[PDB]
Amino acid sequence: DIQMTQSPSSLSTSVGDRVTITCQASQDISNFLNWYQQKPGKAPELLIYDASYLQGGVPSRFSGSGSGTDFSFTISSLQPEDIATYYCQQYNSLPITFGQGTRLEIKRTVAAPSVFIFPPSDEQLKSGTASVVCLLNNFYPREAKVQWKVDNALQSGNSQESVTEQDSKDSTYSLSSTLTLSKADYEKHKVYACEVTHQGLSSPVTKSFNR
Amino acid sequence: ELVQSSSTGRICDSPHQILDGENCTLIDALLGDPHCDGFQNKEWDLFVERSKAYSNCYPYDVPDYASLRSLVASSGTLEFNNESFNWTGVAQNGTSSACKRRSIKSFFSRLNWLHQLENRYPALNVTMPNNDKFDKLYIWGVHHPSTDSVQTSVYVQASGRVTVSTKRSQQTVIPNIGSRPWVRGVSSRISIYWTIVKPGDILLINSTGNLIAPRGYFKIRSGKSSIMRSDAPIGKCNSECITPNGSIPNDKPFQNVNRITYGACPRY
Amino acid sequence: QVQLVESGGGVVQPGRSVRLTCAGSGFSFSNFGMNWVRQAPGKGLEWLAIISYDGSKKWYADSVKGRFTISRDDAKNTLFLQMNSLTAEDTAVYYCSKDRGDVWSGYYRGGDYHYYFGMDVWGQGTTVTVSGASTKGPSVFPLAPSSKSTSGGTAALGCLVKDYFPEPVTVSWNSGALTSGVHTFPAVLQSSGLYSLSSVVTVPSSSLGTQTYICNVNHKPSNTKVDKRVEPK
Ligand SMILES: *[C@@H]1O[C@H](CO[C@@H]2O[C@H](CO)[C@@H](O[C@@H]3O[C@H](CO)[C@@H](O)[C@H](O)[C@@H]3O)[C@H](O)[C@H]2NC(C)=O)[C@@H](O)[C@H](O)[C@H]1NC(C)=O
Ligand SMILES: *[C@@H]1O[C@H](CO)[C@@H](O[C@@H]2O[C@H](CO)[C@@H](O)[C@H](O)[C@H]2NC(C)=O)[C@H](O)[C@H]1NC(C)=O
Ligand SMILES: *[C@@H]1O[C@H](CO)[C@@H](O)[C@H](O)[C@H]1NC(C)=O
Predict the structure, then answer these.
(1) Mind telling me how many Å the CA of C116 is from chain A's nearest CA?
(2) CA angle at A196 for the pair C171 and C185, rounded to the nearest 5°
(3) For C187, which DSSP code?
(4) Same domain, yes or no, for C48 and C106?
(5) Record: contact C107-B59, CB cut-off 8 A
(6) How many domains does chain A fold into?
(7) CB count in 10 Å sphere of residue C102
């Protein structure tokens, strides 16, 4: 039962920079360590095996190093076709365990989100439910805080959010938080607000309606 | 009244001669792993292997590991008698970096890694008569190179062939060239085999490459000794019975501590 | 060509057994072992089980031991994974990989035959979903634009694809004519066992009165196509 810690959980670099992710094992595993690449939606692809060796067909910009407890994974020149999440895997003993994973992203946008709010449609109300949708469009970095306010009271446990992948043009994220309630509980209140906390915002932006 | 269910926790070194394994198993001590040089020509009544044992030489494999482990265990001796084979036309004492003895490239002390001699490697044929009144145990092997260039650089033979035959049995092995995951900086493996030569029988070896030749034999016999896997330390005491959980007094009619034991041990 | 194709993935009810099949062509299958690996949606890669070349060496992960059993058929070059007593956590894309272990690459340590190595050839992965839900078409609702959905000169509108099962749903706008500014978010699994997502689009606020905006939702598991008109409030 050997633990595999992988740091960082994610980073952001430009095209052409030197990227270095690592992997720390909870005990000595010698050189019995491998590196994989998982492009979005595809299966893992082997890149580095036995800590140091490179699998055939892989570009020379990739490389690995390390022995014992600390291992390194290095991309000498990042390329647009290198946007993926990389894992580290051991085989010193059973069970074989993987790493947490490190996602590759892009930097240098640092633009604040555009906040929008959508009250529940009258057709959804007829069915008996009500879902208020809050939209965070085109922002960076990924870290974003969305809080719901129903009559100035903070909510929790009754909302769900989903985030898109980085846009292929401006490398920004989009987030959509959904506050779900029955129509009975929705008609009990008047003001529903969506407050957004982001690094690119000076003060938290709150979009709200009435009824 | 109730049968014995308690062990002292340790194994007594008396009256049975107990040789402990420590970092060496019976096979690594048989082959001559550098960290097992202290077990040469040493006898035992019960050989205890440890879980902390490990190999620190050339990466090898034994196809039928259990039978070779039980042969040496039942004889109770690692007595090795050197023999001079006529390895004419080849170079001897092949060494590797993955097997460091005294901080120098070495190899299994009981094995002779035959390699090329001036880009020449003839079809070796050697014999050994065995004029004694006891069985001989010869330990040999076959080297599996990583690429065809390593097979050429070491033996200058496109395909290796090894054959060890007697009057009763014959053994033919073909090396498999391929890339293995690196173990102690080596992408190659070795397959260890053995051949029993009965009195009056002759040992024969026709090899055209990849031969891990032996340096002699061991005195084998279906004796009273055995082997046991146990982590219990060896203490200074006496006890006629021995279990993997520790020594046991043999006074009660039965016992429920483990199914494996050695000596006059009451039924488990 | 060295490939690994697997099947047997589908929607199954909790507490029921499932057999996963994986067969491969283009290499000596009886010369290596095989591995199983699943990946929870959005989560990392979790290792599962291993078989050696001869089926004598098998090992199951502790989160999986006892529940699953892994088998090998060399005659058809096929790998199997029996899955018994499936709980909700078993929703994952189960991958099929190769031992990278030559029959001869078995270096001995003390007493541990070290046959286990990395994975060099991967499969495609079958989606295995464990739940008690049934097939259903989604209920699409308009996210109408208003003054609360206006930034500068643009306006935000969309559709709420709520309560379907199973995945996935495909969303287009104006029969694929409107593509710029569209954000269809990955679905979320609400506590009712159904899926839900939203698909928004930012359009010029000056065209809200004249331009028609229609989202095209399609859910083949239920054989339902829905066209909802998103109009201002
Ligand atoms: C089985 O092996 C036993 C090994 O004992 C270990 O020997 C190493 C030798 O280097 C010691 O390593 C030390 O490690 C320290 C860091 O952990 C270093 O600072 C230090 O310089 C040194 O390298 C190690 O301490 C030692 N004890 C352990 C690992 O508990 C040996 O002692 C037994 O005799 C042997 N049994 C046999 C051969 O039958
Ligand atoms: C091992 O090689 C030797 C090389 O001479 C073989 O010896 C002869 O092999 C031929 C093969 O046709 C036989 O006809 C002879 O009877 C062998 N002996 C002599 C003295 O010439 C030997 O036979 C080979 N080993 C085996 C098991 O065949
Ligand atoms: C090889 O090593 C052994 C080890 O003792 C030694 O006796 C022998 O002289 C060396 N050389 C040859 C050719 O065997």
Answers:
(1) 6
(2) 15
(3) P
(4) yes
(5) yes
(6) 2
(7) 21
Chains sharing 3 or more CB pairs under 8 A with chain C: A, B
> How was it solved?
X-ray
- Give, using CA atoms, the residue closest to atom 28 of ligand 2: B206
**Which residue range forms the structural domain that includes residue C122?**
3-130
> Cβ distance C224 to C233 under 8 Å?
no
Report how many domains make up chain C.
2
Integer Rg of chain A from CA: 22
Would you call C111 an interface residue with chain B, using a CB distance cutoff of 8 Å? yes
The CA distances from residue A128 to A120, C21, C70, in Å, are 11, 43, 47
Tell me, yes or no, whether A136 and A167 share the same domain: yes
DSSP A168: T
In a mutational test of the A interface, the residue from B54, B182, B186, B187 whose CB has the highest number of chain A CBs within 10 Å is B182
Closest among C148, C146, C136, C133 to C193, alpha carbons compared = C133
CB B91 within 8 Å of CB B115: yes
Burial class of residue A117 (count of CB atoms within 10 Å of its CB; 0-12, 13-18, 19+): buried
- Do B198 and B168 touch, CB atoms closer than 8 A? yes
Round to whole Å and give the CA distance between B178 and C205: 67
Domain identity same for A10 and A100 = yes
Q: What CATH number does residue C166 fall under?
A: 2.60.40.10
Atom of ligand 1 nearest to the CA of B20: 39
Asked if residues C143 and C200 have their Cβ atoms less than 8 Å apart, the reply is: yes
Give the domain range for residue A18. 4-106
Q: Tell me the resolution in Å.
A: 3.5
Of the residues A41, A73, A106, the one at which a domain ends? A106
Domain's final residue, options C69, C95, C130: C130
**Judgement on whether residues C191 and C151 belong to the same structural domain of the protein:** yes
Chain B residues touching A50 at Cβ < 8 A: 181-182
Q: Within a 10 A sphere around the Cβ of C154, how many other Cβ atoms?
A: 19
Based on the fold, state whether residues A62 and A91 are members of the same structural domain.
Answer: yes
Q: How far is CA A47 from CA A35, B61, C119, in A?
A: 6, 28, 10
- Choose the final residue of a domain: A71, A106, A141: A106
Mark which of C96, C130, C164 sits at the end of a domain.
Answer: C130
**C75: DSSP letter:** T
Q: Cβ contact (<8 Å) for A120 and C183?
A: no
CATH number where A82 lies: 2.60.40.10
Q: How many CB pairs under 8 A join A and B?
A: 5
Number of H helices, E strands in chain A: 2, 18
Q: Are residues A153 and A205 in the same domain?
A: yes
Work out the angle at residue B142's Cα, subtended by the Cα atoms of residues C108 and B114, and round it to the nearest 5 degrees.
Answer: 120
- For residue B112, how far is its CA from the centre of ligand 2 (angstroms)? 24
Tokens of A206: 């709150």
Q: Dihedral sign, CA of B196, B201, B202, B204?
A: negative
Tokens of B100: 């460091």
C156 and C63 housed in the same domain: no
Please tell me whether residues C117 and C43 are part of one structural domain: yes
